[PDB]
Symmetry: C5
């Protein structure tokens, strides 16, 4: 990539610069730039650790959707094995919540998936709100509440599936917070500029003791910094459509297929 190509030529410039720039006293020893490189590597490791934690919290939150939606459908079959109208409808809302969450995080438009799973009557209320995924939850709770006032659910077994709508609410909230949070941007931008300036200004610090071999031993260590710095660029925002990013769309079909299998479809 560009960065190391720039470094190899910049390394080339440093060799020519050293010889033809001898008159000015540009003595640049290796010891100071070693203290600097060790320092910013300590910071990159700590930063990349913080980014990686953010990525697996995202991955955990989505793991909880599949768990929570499997157990509420199983509770539904176990507690009310006859009410397939309630099961068809509730599975619709559970599946739509997943796709709505996915389109929300991807800042893309959920209408194709929501008509596919819901009557456009309801699909009109959901998109009329600024919080469409939250209202899908509130509607799924309404189906469960209906069963309670009909005397089909007691308060006890109502509460046990109420607790699964709680697990899903914490997913909704946490995902929004992860999307919304901008704390990583300040640290990383200072590190990114610092990492870059350090690599390009580095052959001028090696050329005194390395001569021609400067390009080789400079393009190498530039690779190991840019690569490890770029790694945090991938985990900082994990809801991206990138192959590196969570396969959010594979995960929603798994959700839909599984909730379809459990409902005798």
């Amino acid at each position: 990539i560009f960065r190391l190509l720039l470094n190899v030529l910049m390394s080339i410039i440093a060799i020519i610069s050293y010889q033809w720039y001898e008159q000015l006293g540009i003595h640049l020893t290796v010891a100071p730039f070693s203290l600097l490189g060790i320092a910013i590597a300590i910071f990159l490791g700590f930063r990349n650790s913080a980014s990686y934690s953010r990525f697996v919290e995202a991955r955990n939150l989505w793991g909880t959707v599949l768990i929570a939606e499997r157990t509420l459908v199983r509770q539904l079959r176990n507690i009310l094995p006859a009410e397939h109208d309630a099961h068809r409808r509730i599975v619709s809302y559970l599946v739509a919540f997943s796709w709505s969450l996915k389109h929300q995080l991807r800042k893309t438009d959920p209408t194709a998936d929501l008509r596919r799973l819901l009557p456009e009557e309801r699909v009109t209320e959901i998109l009329a709100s600024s919080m469409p995924t939250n209202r899908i939850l509130l509607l799924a709770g309404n189906e469960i509440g209906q069963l309670r006032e009909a005397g089909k659910l007691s308060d006890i077994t109502y509460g046990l599936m109420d607790n699964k709508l709680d697990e899903l609410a914490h997913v909704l909230g946490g995902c929004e917070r992860l999307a919304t949070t901008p704390v990583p941007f300040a640290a990383t931008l200072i590190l990114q500029r610092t990492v870059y300036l350090f690599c390009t200004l580095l052959p001028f610090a090696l050329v005194g003791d390395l001569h021609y071999m400067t390009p080789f031993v400079s393009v190498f260590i530039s690779y190991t910094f840019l690569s490890w710095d770029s790694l945090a660029e991938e985990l900082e925002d994990p809801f991206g459509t990138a192959a590196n990013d969570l396969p959010l769309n594979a995960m929603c079909n798994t959700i839909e297929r599984n909730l379809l299998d459990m409902t005798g479809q």
Copy 2:
């Protein structure tokens, strides 16, 4: 910030170090780079662990504000799933939940909550809330009376009361976590680490000038920037409930919460 000035000190110090260089060899004073390499590496390790503790303190603060929104969403949702017809209780409870959020904001920011309280609640409750050592505690007490009176009237069983009571429990744990991060910021985690990061940076050009005849200023400023950049980020993370640009945007988060709760109750 204070980082631009401390950068300018370092430059001046490099110039002082070059002139100090002529007197340095006869003076019998030699400052090699190797002892400062060791000191600089140890300082970087300590700042690494420190920033990590500051970032976690910051992450938890926004996590705690994350579940105000979550707990209040589901409490409003339970109210409508269990008592779909009690819109009076829906509205009073929502006004308490909205008041809890704004008063929590005022509590962490050490500012006056009466205006926000007077917009959302009747005046006799505002006096009740402000007489309390913990006004946001008193608000959870009042919301609890709403669900508690619905229970007395027989419109809530003990089961469905407990379900909503749990959400007021979650709000209390949010309340105590925020109070805890405010009253528990360690001193030497910034006493040492800014005095020594400061003193290390001003002393560095002197240790560097023997090896770099005129480049002492440039490389010394690069090193000082990265130590001061990394060090000050931890104090931009040290007051997550503060009011700087990198602190939590708690006003916007209170508007988000209230707009969320109003949207759920048809307003």
Copy 3:
């Protein structure tokens, strides 16, 4: 592995040889630049290994929860329905089937024999037909206590106490499927650590001469031993040395539940 150590011992020897021309060709491969590169690689190896250990530790805990949850579900059936041993043995068979199925699911092998050894062939087909057979097994564990509730021998309360244990086992199922399915981070380190070990003696040749190959191999031992432990801790459901003994764990589970039903 050992091939790589032997190659470093050679590659040191090529540096041994190629040193005769360092002066005439103009080479100054000095040590301090490689001393900085190795220290940074160690920092990233330490962090990557620590993240690899966490996935392994979390995988270990998920499987611990299977044994804990299935134990106390069986405790509850005995404490609450002590004379219902037709139901005890049916539910226990699904629980044992659950843990073997998850082993096969994470290992990508055939559960049919295990399912047949433990369940009637009628339900072995229902399980072998679902998208997630482990998921179906829990569904069928839930109809057993579900029916006891409409048999009226479980109240909604005591039903829910055992329902909670099935929620616990679903969290394990999702936890494992998330770790089994969840490149650069390694790919960066996998490529970089190797190239540093082959180039190091050429920069070491300069002061170690003949004792170049053994410090070069000593250093490379420390680095490669650490990097490969991360790759096997990364795949905790694999078959490597320090991978989870899943077969032993399912047997422990089985002879635990076959100890609590009479």
Copy 4:
């Protein structure tokens, strides 16, 4: 903060090293700085990790005291929300909950809790609590009896009794967790060898620097020693979180805050 002592000893070792350096090489005794940077960086790594473990102990202690306030605040809230008219019982339980906080504090500080018990509770139960060898735990059971008597009198249902029983379980986890944190010198050697090891490195450091610095040895040596000593000292401070240092837990503040909260919270 006896850092000043081994700072002033460090200056001494520096001047012996200076005057005795010339004498010192009488047969080939030589101390370079490179072995002392390998050793010093290693010691720095182990200090960061140790300090990170000590900080975690501090954060857990604060979290445990946090939920004392949270659990006690919601327990008395549930009492007023569920039984608004039974204030004879609110006063009895509030004083047990307040006595639990103070009794917990005296137990961790190894101080006499009699004055705070005789001020909150009737003397017949004060002697029952002092007779027991686990007094804080006996306060919990006593608070539990109050809830239990309200349940045998039909004023509480099993469900509503259950919601409050939960909060007593929260306090039971606090007590045990606090007791485990107090009794954990465990491997005190981990900081005990490190305290000495850091001490020997800082005494020997000027002898390893005089060849490079000469007269500037005591300045660079005290700076390196200060950095290492203070970070070590912060750790020995953090890992005794119930101690009496300033960086420790304001236990007094929290006990008074919850008493005021509970009092202001009922009249």
Copy 5:
């Protein structure tokens, strides 16, 4: 202290090193500090991460045993508060709860729980516990039957049965956790690598140091090696938390504390 073998051996290596370095100049062998610093710094980072794992695992073991004391305290509290008249049931459930602690100590120490079981329970129930291949787990089942018998006799409702049942769940995560920790060491590879790499590094160190320290090599090579060995040893003093060594957990003392707590709450 397998440490003085490696520490004292370091002194012998240092003397062999001085004579050896003048010969090394003649031979073609030559050792510098800087390569070993790269080694030593790499080892210390790895030593630091391993020891953090070893420490976390020791902390989890101490946590789990603390839960035994917490959960049995509240189980006893609930019983008195909910069934204050039921002293016979109080005493029976307390003995199982005490028996579980001791039986968990014995099993983690692979020692014989028979004498303790017979001091606390009727022999007819000691036989049942010892017949099982998982005795401590069976102690939980018997305690659950005491609670369950109270539920069927109508003295406990399903609600208050469940409040107590949740506490036996707490004890079941302790038992699982301890069994897991008792069988899952911090990887053999981790400690093996670090055992041999610190060893080899400690013996070959005085060689690389001899050119810089002349006659001072042993007084510094033993100081450096001592740091790396004491820090690798601490991971081997946190590996065996259920053993009987001084820095292991005082499980016997922790078990006595639990017993006298529960007798304190039941008058006995």
